[PDB]
Design a protein around this ligand. Structure first.
Ligand code: PC1
Ligand code: PC1
Ligand code: PC1
Ligand code: 3PE
Ligand code: 3PE
Ligand code: 3PE
Ligand code: 3PE
Ligand code: 3PE
Ligand code: DCQ
Ligand code: SF4
Lengths: 70, 169, 105, 104, 47, 156, 80, 318, 98
């Protein structure tokens, strides 16, 4: 009866689920298990490039805390 | 190569203007002005004018060239030596300009121009938690009162003018 | 016919967008705020004829701030001599000009 | 940069699908099928120009989410309501002089 | 002063109004031939 | 051989896709249009076979000639058939489209639509029922299923 | 005036709703008690750096530390 | 690593567009007391594959074209715009997280009329050109209320960033303060994609869709799949902008499932509208725009300007 | 100065000489005129973003709005010319020689 439309809607829902889950896992993969740094403004980009300079390995996501100072 | 990206887009911009200014038809002229508006929007976007480039795509290419193609469809039938000859003339003059300014790193067509890429002339600071261009456009309402008055009045008058002169009575 | 109605009535119709040194939103300075302020405070009141000759130095500094023609010419000279010395093999770039030095902060 | 890669990828996929849609049905060599100004409306042009002028008024109206952050809120609110009022006055004059007729 | 070139010119109209120097005819039928399908209509549209 | 197997599977693929996605251009000439509309009714429901209802006249796979063809609409029928992209198919529906029918000896009736267009399936009746028309469409799909386009291409 | 208002609400309810919503948008911020707080929040949002003053000797209203009592306060924004 | 992300956006777009045809035919089947496809696959699952293979080997139609270059460029531009409308969509993290994503989508949807206009140019008919001008005039008409309703909504957001619009709707759905904007938005997005009851070129009320005349068209499958990419995209955009879901930054798939279910319900609401109403006459939806939607749009635009000032609720800039 | 300024100026002169040399149509003239406007838009925007002069960020929008209203007025003149003469050809606009 009416539930016969549900395999097509289920396939369409999996096809809509794949881009978002995919880009969430990719942003966690390429950023050290965290969210991608959103730099919409120039101050956020300055902090981000400062992270890229202070990490030493040319990667902004390598976070350095209190262990990096004496 | 990638440091010269605004220069490459500006050469594509001049090539597109030589394209539609040769005027094969207003149809292909409109198409050439659309492609030229897209690459000039890219030029604007690569200096940091994100809102102004989206104003290109949304207002210029989004409304006005739509109305030009709309009127070209409606007031012209549905689609040479002189066109292609003036096209290759403009293309050869622009590539000779490119060749001169890349071999000398200096040129003088009317004024003097540097031959390096235009990445050299940028600022080395930040703007904080705002865009300077966005806040200057937000200043249209707070600081630009008289400018809004004359622009809105000119648009109201423009509606009145087009309804008068297209009436035919 | 410059009917100066803005000064007769005391309204600010378009004086605000006129120069870069005016009051800006969120106190944003231009890239040549100081040079333009110096040229304007030089040329104020003295007339255009006296401003062409007595404010030449501030105006040349301000035009060269705007267009950066002498600056880009000097950088062209330094970079062309650098590439010529790489061509002759009399020079090698230092490690702080090759990207292998772990930038400051 | 990532945007330019994405635009080129979308353009490339579109062009590849267009190439498939034009050349793949040219593989199956079919039969050779040998058997065997425009009228002007003023109303189409007036709806196009009314769109264009209202889109210019929209172009004035677009920095309002940024304009609401100002310190001069009396002036900003006045000029905001004044631009939307002039858009409505353009619509009212477009109404009453029979501009919105037969494409209402 | 009528010359060789400027001799074919006429004086303008006195009211400065020139003569203007028609509508669409559509051959029309029903879109999908299921209900009617066998109708031919020769329209004379006016926009 | 390997190439014969590959072209056999590719013929199976294209025949599956063509028979299972038929789009009909029905001519609603006469009473058979009512019974085609019952072949699209919710009892018989041509749309569950992939046979869509109210397809475009231009991108259709089969021209169902459903009604009485007259001498005044013979060039219109042939012009529509000339506009159809291949593979185009013709199902004749009912006796007037088959052979003139109840109006066979008339001065103004084309005696069968096979005098004008090449016909693949003949669906007989006056009117042939919606079930009989759906039988004719399924027999058309069987006729599409046993096409050998790439096998004959490989053997020429 | 109420017969015409019912007449235009019977004939053209879209335009009546349009002029009513636009009339509220015009006249209502002059009557709202919270229109003042819009200004007070927009001017108290620190987009720039609070460039300090050289302590000459007599500036009692200007604090010497952020946690000093004097200076502009945002207790009204925390409370409202 | 980023190209993998671009592909995992744009290929499931094409697969969801393929199966929206199945979902439409099945739901329009069961809403019409009948079935949709259930013979071609198990429960109809092979109907989009069969239909796409059927369309992709079909002959070019009958005629030649007036302009070959625009006949090629109009499907290219339609598909390119219909794929670039997805890249700023926060789902919960967008592919291209740009500051002006709303404005980007408004501009790239304003550019979508060039495919209609250039396909009207490329066909040899002078009547298909008139029909294309009618469709262009319809689309640019409803772009006005798209822009102004969109602006009025983003006055409660603070910026043109689409990713901020998830943060805006954490306490309430934004349809609760702006349901008149939401209902005019939904009907205007319905009228953008030439969707019923506004599909005047695909149906009657049309000078050219008239049983055996001229006008070479392009490949139907590419225009059709660009149209359904536009439909799924505008339903996702309406979902993000009025029915915003809960975002947990440690479990983003909760947001992804939630807005996916809402977007599916909204695309099914498109399917349920098209199986319910007769079409407008062309001047009747011109009337519906200019004399009905647009005065309410300007009135509510004034209200949503003046309202965060009278309530002291101006949203943050950043 | 900057190299891109040469290209935007030369684009303005290209659309100038195209506007200053008619072939047949009036629509081609209006397209060259709006290409001139486009080059003005780009060049003003590059100056204003180049100098970080904040208040003139609203200037290219005002340029765009006024000259697109100008474009609408020119298209309306073209519509009236094409309704009078049947085409938008500029050689039909020749009655003012006498
Ligand atoms: C029709 C006119 C409607 C708007 C009327 C003025 C609205 C307003 O708030 O103006 C104050 C605004 C702004 O005032 P203000 O108080 O913000 O000015 C202080 C200076 N700034 C901006 C740096 C904070 O405009 C003016 O004062 C000058 C512009 C209007 C001048 C008169 C125009 C007459 C037009 C006749 C045609
Ligand atoms: C993007 C979606 C997925 C891709 C699309 C679907 C996948 C399948 C696409 C290919 C299908 C097969 C090729 C096109 C159809 C051929 C049918 C046909 O009539 O062929 C006869 C034609 C011609 O056969 P013929 O010589 O007998 O011609 C008969 C026609 N008359 C008499 C009018 C001349 O065959 C070919 O031209 C062969 C082309 C190559 C076949 C495939 C090779 C492998 C491809 C991988
Ligand atoms: C976003 C998620 C979903 C949101 C909801 C949308 C889904 C529901 C869709 C239902 C099916 C729609 C299918 C297509 C229908 C197309 C036709 C159509 O929409 O026609 C619109 C009709 C057209 O009107 P009409 O044609 O019926 O009326 C006749 C018109 N005249 C008289 C001119 C001839 O209505 C509108 O245009 C109304 C738009 C929305 C109005 C919102 C008003 C809000 C309330 C304001 C305040 C009122 C109180 C008074 C003042 C108080 C002051 C304090
Ligand atoms: C993001 C998710 C996207 C998912 C998209 C797809 C959704 C649907 C998923 C699959 C559903 C079931 C598919 C069943 C296909 C039909 C199989 C069938 O009946 O084949 C029979 C046919 C003839 O067999 P024969 O041997 O002649 O039989 C005689 C028996 N005495 O035999 C043949 O024709 C030969 C075998 C054909 C097998 C075809 C299998 C289906 C292919 C569909 C393409 C997509 C599949 C999924 C891809 C993504 C996941 C990997
Ligand atoms: C080296 C060797 C290989 C060489 C290259 C070939 C590769 C494989 C090609 C695909 C498979 C070829 C065979 C196709 C089907 C042939 C078998 C067949 O006819 O099965 C019939 C059966 C249904 O029987 P039917 O007669 O319809 O019954 C009515 C209901 N009782 O049919 C069914 O049950 C369903 C049949 C499904 C067919 C397969 C699924 C479609 C193809 C998927 C991949 C291609 C498309 C990719 C995506 C396209 C765009 C979306
Ligand atoms: C001052 C407030 C702000 C005002 C400016 C902002 C307005 C925002 C909305 C934009 C409206 C734009 C278009 C306005 C056009 C008005 C003229 C008009 O439409 O007149 C024609 C109409 C009769 O329609 P008809 O010609 O028959 O068309 C066929 C459709 N069935 O005629 C009518 O139906 C009569 C229309 C006028 C009467 C409406 C009265 C509404 C009263 C509501 C309560 C009071 C609201 C407060 C404001 C005071 C209003 C006087
Ligand atoms: C007939 C011809 C072919 C037709 C088919 C193909 C063309 C049509 C479809 C493609 C349309 C392309 C639109 C590209 C511009 C979109 C605006 C844009 O770039 O916005 C994103 C972003 C601004 O956002 P924001 O976050 O503020 O900036 C980043 C700071 N964190 O800004 C950025 O990220 C800027 C990135 C660098 C600049 C790239 C600009 C695009 C490349 C040049 C133009 C190419 C297209 C030319 C033709 C377009 C159609 C007219
Ligand atoms: C002097 C200033 C310009 C310098 C460059 C000249 C390029 C070569 C053109 C020389 C003149 C050619 C000519 O006859 O142009 C006339 C033509 C309009 O005439 P048409 O209607 O095509 O047919 C009658 C044939 N004369 O007019 C056109 O075709 C107009 C084409 C204008 C496009 C200019 C493109 C850039 C040219 C180089 C930069 C300046
Ligand atoms: C890439 C995948 C392409 C799938 C194409 C599916 C086309 C839709 C099939 C049925 C159909 C519907 C619903 C439809 O609405 C329509 O327009 C009236 C058609 O064209 C005549 C159709 O054929
Ligand atoms: S075969 Fe008979 S019943 Fe059928 S359409 Fe003809 S006249 Fe009518």
């Amino acid at each position: 009866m009416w539930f016969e439309v549900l395999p097509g809607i289920a396939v369409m829902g999996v096809c809509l689920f794949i881009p978002g889950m995919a880009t969430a896992r990719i942003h966690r993969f390429s950023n050290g298990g965290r969210e991608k740094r959103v730099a919409h403004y120039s101050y956020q980009w300055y902090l981000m490039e400062r992270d890229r300079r202070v990490s030493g390995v040319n990667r902004y996501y390598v976070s350095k805390g209190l262990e990096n100072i004496d | 190569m990638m440091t010269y990206i605004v220069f490459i887009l500006s050469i594509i911009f001049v090539m597109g203007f030589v394209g539609f200014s040769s005027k094969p038809s207003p149809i292909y002229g409109g198409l050439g002005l659309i492609v030229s508006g897209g690459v000039g929007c890219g030029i604007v976007l690569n200096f940091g004018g994100s809102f102004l480039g989206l104003m290109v795509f949304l207002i210029y290419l989004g409304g006005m060239m739509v109305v030009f193609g709309y009127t070209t469809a409606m007031a012209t039938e549905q689609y040479n030596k002189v066109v292609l000859g003036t096209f290759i003339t403009g293309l050869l003059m622009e590539f000779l300009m490119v060749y001169y300014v890349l071999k000398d790193k200096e040129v003088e067509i009317v004024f003097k121009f540097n031959g390096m890429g235009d990445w050299v002339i940028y600022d080395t600071g930040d703007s904080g938690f705002f865009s300077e261009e966005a806040m200057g456009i937000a200043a249209l309402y707070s600081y630009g009162t008289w400018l809004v008055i004359v622009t809105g009045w000119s648009l109201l008058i423009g509606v009145v003018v087009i309804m008068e002169i297209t009436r035919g009575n | 016919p410059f009917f100066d109605v803005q000064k007769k009535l005391g309204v600010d119709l378009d004086h605000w967008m006129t120069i870069q040194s005016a009051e800006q939103p969120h106190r944003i300075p231009a890239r040549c705020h100081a040079f333009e302020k110096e040229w304007i405070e030089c040329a104020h009141g003295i007339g255009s004829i006296r401003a062409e000759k007595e404010c030449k130095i501030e105006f040349e500094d301000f035009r060269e701030c705007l267009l950066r023609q002498k600056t880009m010419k000097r950088l062209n000279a330094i970079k062309r001599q650098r590439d010529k010395l790489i061509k002759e093999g009399k020079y090698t770039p230092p490690p702080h000009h090759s990207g292998q030095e772990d930038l400051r902060p | 940069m990532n945007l330019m890669i994405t635009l080129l990828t979308n353009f490339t996929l579109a062009t590849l699908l267009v190439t498939i849609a034009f050349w793949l049905p040219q593989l199956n060599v079919y039969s050779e099928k040998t058997s065997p100004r425009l009228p002007f409306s003023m109303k189409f042009f007036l709806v196009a120009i009314t769109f264009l002028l209202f889109d210019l008024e929209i172009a004035l109206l677009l920095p309002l989410p940024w304009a609401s952050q100002t310190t001069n809120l009396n002036t900003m609110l006045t000029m905001a309501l004044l631009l939307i009022f002039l858009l409505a006055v353009s619509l009212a004059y477009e109404w009453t002089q029979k501009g919105l007729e037969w494409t209402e | 002063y009528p010359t060789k070139e400027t001799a074919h010119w006429k004086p303008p109209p006195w009211n400065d109004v020139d003569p203007p120097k028609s509508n669409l005819t559509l051959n029309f039928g029903p879109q999908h031939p299921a209900a009617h399908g066998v109708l031919r209509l020769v329209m004379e549209l006016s926009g | 051989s390997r190439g014969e197997y590959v072209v056999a599977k590719l013929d199976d693929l294209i025949n599956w896709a063509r028979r299972s996605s038929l789009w009909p251009m029905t001519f609603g000439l006469a009473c058979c249009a009512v019974e085609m509309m019952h072949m699209a009714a919710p009892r018989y429901d041509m749309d569950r076979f992939g046979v869509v209802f109210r397809a475009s006249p231009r991108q259709s796979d089969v021209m169902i000639v459903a009604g009485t063809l007259t001498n005044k609409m013979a060039p219109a029928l042939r012009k529509v058939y000339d506009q159809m992209p291949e593979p185009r198919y013709v199902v004749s529906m009912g006796s007037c489209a088959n052979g003139g029918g109840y109006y066979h000896y008339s001065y103004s009736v084309v005696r069968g639509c096979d005098r004008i267009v090449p016909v693949d399936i003949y669906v007989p009746g006056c009117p042939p029922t919606a079930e009989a028309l759906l039988y004719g469409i399924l027999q058309l799909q069987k006729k599409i299923k046993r096409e050998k386009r790439l096998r004959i291409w490989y053997r020429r | 005036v109420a017969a015409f208002l019912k007449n235009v609400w019977a004939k053209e309810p879209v335009l009546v709703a349009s002029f009513a919503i636009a009339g509220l948008a015009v006249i209502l911020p002059t009557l709202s008690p919270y229109t003042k707080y819009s200004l007070m929040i927009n001017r108290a949002t620190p987009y720039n750096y609070p460039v300090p003053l050289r302590d000459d000797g007599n500036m009692p209203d200007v604090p010497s530390h952020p946690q000093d009592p004097q200076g502009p306060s945002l207790e009204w924004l925390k409370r409202l | 690593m980023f190209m993998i992300n671009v592909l995992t956006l744009i290929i499931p777009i094409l697969l969801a567009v393929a199966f929206l045809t199945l979902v439409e035919r099945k739901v329009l089947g069961y809403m019409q007391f009948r079935k949709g496809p259930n013979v071609v696959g198990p429960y109809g699952l092979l109907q989009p594959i069969a239909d796409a293979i059927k369309l992709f080997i079909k002959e070019p139609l009958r005629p030649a074209t007036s302009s070959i270059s625009m006949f090629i460029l109009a499907p290219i531009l339609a598909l390119t715009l219909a794929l670039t409308m997805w890249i700023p969509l926060p789902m919960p993290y967008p592919l291209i997280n740009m500051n002006l994503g709303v404005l980007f989508m408004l501009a790239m949807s304003s550019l979508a009329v060039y495919s209609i206009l250039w396909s009207g140019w490329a066909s040899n008919s002078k009547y298909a050109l008139i029909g294309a001008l009618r469709a262009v005039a319809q689309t640019i008409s409803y772009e006005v209320t798209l822009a102004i309703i969109l602006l009025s909504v983003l006055l409660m957001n603070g910026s043109f960033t689409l990713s901020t619009l998830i943060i805006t709707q954490e306490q309430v759905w934004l349809i609760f303060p702006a349901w008149p904007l939401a209902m005019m938005w939904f009907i205007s997005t319905l009228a953008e994609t030439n969707r019923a009851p506004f599909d005047l070129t695909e149906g009657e009320s049309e000078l050219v869709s008239g049983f055996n005349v001229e006008y070479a068209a392009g490949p139907f499958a590419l225009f059709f799949m660009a149209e359904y990419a536009n439909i799924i995209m505008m339903n996702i955009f309406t979902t993000t902008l009025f029915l915003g879901a809960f975002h947990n930054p440690y479990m983003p798939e909760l947001y992804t499932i939630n807005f996916t279910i809402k977007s599916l319900l909204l695309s099914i609401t498109f399917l349920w509208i098209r199986a319910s109403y007769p079409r407008f006459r062309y001047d009747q939806l011109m009337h519906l725009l200019w004399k009905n939607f647009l005065p309410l749009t300007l009135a509510l635009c004034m209200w949503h300007v003046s309202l965060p000032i009278l309530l002291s609720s101006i949203p943050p800039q950043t | 100065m900057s190299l891109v300024y040469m290209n935007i100026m030369m684009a303005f002169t290209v659309s100038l000489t195209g506007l200053l040399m008619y072939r047949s149509h009036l629509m081609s003239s209006l397209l060259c005129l709006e290409g001139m406007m486009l080059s003005l838009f780009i060049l003003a925007t590059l100056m204003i973003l180049n100098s970080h002069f904040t208040l003139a960020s609203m200037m290219p929008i005002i340029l765009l709005v006024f000259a697109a209203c100008e474009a609408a007025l020119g298209l309306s003149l073209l519509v009236m010319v094409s309704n009078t003469y049947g085409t938008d050809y500029v050689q039909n606009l020749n009655l003012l020689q006498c």
